Design a binder for this molecule. Structure first.
Ligand SMILES: C=C1[C@@H](O)[C@@H]2O[C@]3(CC[C@H](/C=C/[C@@H](C)[C@@H]4CC(C)=C[C@@]5(O[C@H](C[C@@](C)(O)C(=O)O)CC[C@H]5O)O4)O3)CC[C@H]2O[C@@H]1[C@@H](O)C[C@H](C)[C@H]1O[C@@]2(CC[C@H]1C)OCCC[C@H]2C
Ligand SMILES: [Mn+2]
Ligand SMILES: [Mn+2]
Lengths: 581, 288
């Protein structure tokens, strides 16, 4: 090896002419050492064939070469970069073949029209008409960048090779051609899109291999946009209508997946004619993957129907299918629907929502699958900003209050975990008047786990409304429990003070909670007493130092003299942790 | 040593048995503590009274989910920690471990199953073998069970015990007068306290268990009046509703093993005696 190039090499390992990783990235510098002439005459050549399999390296080498135009002599020599890139394109680990292509696409623009024809396109062919397969999987991504700029004669040539790539004998070289047919389509003259693209499209849509067919749906969106509305019915729709009917649910899945994109690409008229029925068929597909994909698109679809026929196709074509899906067996499907169904309100109005959706809204808020009622609960903002907070509270509140008080705790625990959500959505004014009551009631529930749930639920609530809202709406009622005759409730009080010090700030804790805590150091029951020690150890860090020494230290010290073993022990522990011992 | 007990408890809460080594330790100390206690152990409220558990470890965890974690919530278990259930070892060891760490927060009584012969017929003995390869852990626990207090008096008004009343015991003093440091006898006061069952036939009757007796309401009223008791709180009997009142409320049964033997389909309950001896029940189903 020789300097300066030898600096790239890693003489310390045991490879096969491997390069220094942290160095291939510092390549623009060696290029600057020797000049532009020597970068071409010796650096590139060395990089071209010295292609070990050190992947982290191969990747960088591919990326780095896409920003070397200028260190090679500028445009006039940009093609010196082809050889090493052509190679890197046919490698293994796709990540590399990708970078190779991205770079090849980048520098394609640097090549002059004349150089494209002389060096680039020729590289496209050798990759297309290449033996190996990856060499072709990657040729597909290089047609759209050179087509527009080369000659009418070469344009033709390029079209032919792209064709041959679509009809390749290998499924992969076909899946690849298909997923790049759209972009290639966009750079051809309308004429050739009709005479050349359409036939390739038609062919790939009716491929023996469905892994190839499901990919032509995406191509259909692109081709469909490029063509004038009147040409759609003759050149495309038969193929698309067939796809939604395809034997392979995978192909149907892609149709429901790209439905909204097809809608736009095809136009309102055809959407009302051909797509509304297709959509209904997909929502009733035997395979739940397809029904779900479809249900997911419900809101986006109705949104895009022509303003004039909108509300009608909805109440007459779409809505009856939706009532069906809310009852589907698969939770996969009820799932997809619930995460978007209430988004239809601002497209049916206050009146329509109140009469036709609010019922489906309840049918799901009381569904078995937890994810389902949760999806409905996570999206109230729109139904709420459409119908009135009262008209909603009038159709949701009884659902909640009925579950917040129910047979099984667990079922109750579930409603406790909707609160931070309902809060954040419906607002603090609604919460202070219809929900705060329920959250306080749970603090005193018979079941411990419920009390516990509601305790930490307060912290989540303060994170939603703030420390001021806490000092005014919640701390007053929480403290009131310290006077409770039942020790289970008095402890609940200290448990709420423990959690609320985490988010109420030093002021509000010292002034409005610390006093109540220190005041219970003389509670008649030992359990409250030692839990007081614990509470001071918990909130101690939030209090400033003067407080910890003037008011806490004394109380703990006294507790250490208590008759009870545990109050004594926990008192000591608190001192030691706070460093007041 | 305290940091240790805390760890042992953290372990047992993950349902992971302690080692033969540690059990031997835990038991020696538990004995020390349990010896000082009386045959009619004084328990001051507030405290939650629990009935049978029988190795149903996950239902025990459900019990703590409902009544609160120890030592925050005080507990009084009326015996029957082993047999029938699938985790006798984890269950009884967690409980004894709670007792050694928090003498004043937990009270454990002896049930008819905290004994040597019955544990070799219904689980515990064989489970110990499958989990320790030898009978030592079983001997450490059955020896310990000899020290378990036969009964507890809460606030000098609520008398708690596993089984029930004996025709050869009419006063709390008669009970304090027994020597409980021995295996459970096949007949007599000590036996009866752990084996008898309240009945809806008057006076004394022949127990279908083959040990102890049945006793009607008349017997309870007399026992209660003669001892300044407001209630007799016991377990030992499967009760579908989890808990059950009988004898014009002079007696209450509290079973804490939901779906007993994993086939009965009964609810379980625990009884909360507050700061004022006011009682409330919590019924629960088996934990999922
Ligand atoms: C346990 C019991 C009794 O308690 C049980 O009392 C009866 C009436 C009510 C009870 C069943 C309750 C239901 C709810 C359960 C439900 C289920 C699903 C199962 C089942 O479980 C029972 C055993 C057990 C545990 O699960 C239980 O006590 O519930 C056995 C019968 C089962 O159908 O009944 O049965 C009659 C049968 C009787 O047998 C045995 C009894 O021989 C045990 C003898 C009497 C004992 O002698 C000894 C040694 C230890 C032991 C052999 O110590 C007492 C002094 C003499 C001494 C030799
Ligand atoms: Mn029993
Ligand atoms: Mn029992």
């Amino acid at each position: 090896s020789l300097y300066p190039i030898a600096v790239l090499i890693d003489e310390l390992r045991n490879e096969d002419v491997q390069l220094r990783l942290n160095s291939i990235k510092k390549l623009s510098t060696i290029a600057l050492a020797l000049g532009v002439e020597r970068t071409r005459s010796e650096l590139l050549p060395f990089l071209t064939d010295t292609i070990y399999d050190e992947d982290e390296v191969l990747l960088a080498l591919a990326e780095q070469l896409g920003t070397f135009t200028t260190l090679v002599g500028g445009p006039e020599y940009v093609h010196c970069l082809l050889p090493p890139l052509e190679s890197l394109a046919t490698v293994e680990e796709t990540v590399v073949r990708d970078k190779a292509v991205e770079s090849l696409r980048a520098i394609s623009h640097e090549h002059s029209p004349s150089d494209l024809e002389a060096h680039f396109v020729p590289l496209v062919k050798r990759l297309a008409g290449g033996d190996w397969f990856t060499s072709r999987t990657s040729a597909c991504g290089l047609f759209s960048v050179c087509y527009p700029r080369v000659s009418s004669a070469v344009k033709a040539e390029l079209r032919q090779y792209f064709r041959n790539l679509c009809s390749d004998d290998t499924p992969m070289v076909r899946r690849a051609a298909a997923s790049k047919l759209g972009e290639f389509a966009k750079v051809l003259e309308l004429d050739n899109v009709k005479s050349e693209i359409i036939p390739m499209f038609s062919n790939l849509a009716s491929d023996e291999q469905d892994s190839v067919r499901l990919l032509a749906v995406e191509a259909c969106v692109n081709i469909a946009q490029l063509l004038p509305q009147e040409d759609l019915e003759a050149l495309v729709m038969p193929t698309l209508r067939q796809a939604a009917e395809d034997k392979s649910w995978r192909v149907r899945y892609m149709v429901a997946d790209k439905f909204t994109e097809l809608q736009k690409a095809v136009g309102p008229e055809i959407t009302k004619t051909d797509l509304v029925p297709a959509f209904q068929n997909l929502m009733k597909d035997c395979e739940a993957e397809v029904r779900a994909a479809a249900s997911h698109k419900v809101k986006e679809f109705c949104e895009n129907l022509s303003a004039d026929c909108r509300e009608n196709v909805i109440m007459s074509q779409i809505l009856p299918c939706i009532k069906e899906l809310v009852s589907d067996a698969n939770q996969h499907v009820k799932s997809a629907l619930a995460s978007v169904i209430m988004g239809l309100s601002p497209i049916l109005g206050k009146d329509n929502t109140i009469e036709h959706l609010l019922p489906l809204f309840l049918a799901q808020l009381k569904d078995e699958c937890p994810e389902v009622r949760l999806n409905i609960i996570s999206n109230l903002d729109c139904v709420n900003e459409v119908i009135g907070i009262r008209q909603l509270s009038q159709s949701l509140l009884p659902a909640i209050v009925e579950l917040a008080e129910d047979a099984k705790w667990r079922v109750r625990l579930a409603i406790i975990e909707y609160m931070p959500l309902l809060a954040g959505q419906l607002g603090v004014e609604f919460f202070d008047e219809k929900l705060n009551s329920l959250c306080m009631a749970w603090l005193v529930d018979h079941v411990y786990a419920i009390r516990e749930a509601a305790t930490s639920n307060l912290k989540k609530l303060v994170e939603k409304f703030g420390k001021e809202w806490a000092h005014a709406t919640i701390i007053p009622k929480v403290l009131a429990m310290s006077g409770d005759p039942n020790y289970l409730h008095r402890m609940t009080t200290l448990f709420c003070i423990n959690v609320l010090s985490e988010v109420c700030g030093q002021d509000i804790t010292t002034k409005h909670m610390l006093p109540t805590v220190l005041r219970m150091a003389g509670d008649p029951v030992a359990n409250v007493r030692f839990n007081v020690a614990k509470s001071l150890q918990k909130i101690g860090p939030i209090l400033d130092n003067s407080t910890l020494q003037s008011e806490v230290k004394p109380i703990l010290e006294k507790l250490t003299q208590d008759q009870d073993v545990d109050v004594k022990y926990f008192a000591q522990e608190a001192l030691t942790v706070l460093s007041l011992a | 040593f305290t940091k240790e007990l805390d760890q042992w408890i953290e372990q047992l809460n993950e349902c992971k048995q302690l080692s033969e080594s540690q059990v031997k330790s835990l038991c020696e100390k538990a004995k020390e503590i349990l010896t000082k206690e009386s045959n009619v152990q004084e328990v001051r409220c507030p405290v939650t009274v629990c009935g049978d558990v029988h190795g149903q470890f996950h239902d025990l965890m459900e019990l703590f989910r409902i009544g609160g974690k120890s030592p925050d919530t005080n507990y009084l278990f009326m015996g029957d920690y082993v047999d029938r259930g699938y985790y006798s070892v984890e269950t009884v060891t967690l409980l004894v471990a709670l007792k050694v760490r928090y003498r004043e927060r937990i009270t454990i009584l002896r049930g008819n199953h905290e004994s040597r012969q019955i544990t070799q017929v219904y689980g515990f003995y064989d489970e110990c073998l499958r989990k320790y390869g030898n009978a030592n852990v079983w001997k450490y626990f059955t020896d310990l069970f000899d020290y378990l207090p036969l009964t507890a008096l809460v606030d000098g008004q609520i008398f708690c015990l596993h089984g029930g009343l004996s025709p050869s015991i009419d006063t709390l003093d008669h009970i304090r007068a027994l020597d409980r440091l021995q295996e459970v006898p096949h007949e007599g006061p000590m036996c009866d306290l752990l084996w008898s069952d309240p009945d809806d036939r008057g006076g004394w009757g022949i127990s279908p268990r083959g040990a102890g007796y049945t006793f009607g309401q008349d017997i309870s009223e007399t026992f209660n009046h003669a001892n300044g008791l407001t209630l007799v709180s016991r377990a030992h009997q499967l009760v579908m509703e989890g808990y059950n009142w009988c004898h014009d409320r002079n007696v209450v049964t509290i079973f804490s093993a939901p779906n007993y033997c994993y086939r009965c389909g009964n609810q379980a309950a625990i009884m909360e005696l507050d700061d004022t001896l006011k009682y409330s029940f919590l019924q629960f189903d088996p934990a999922p």
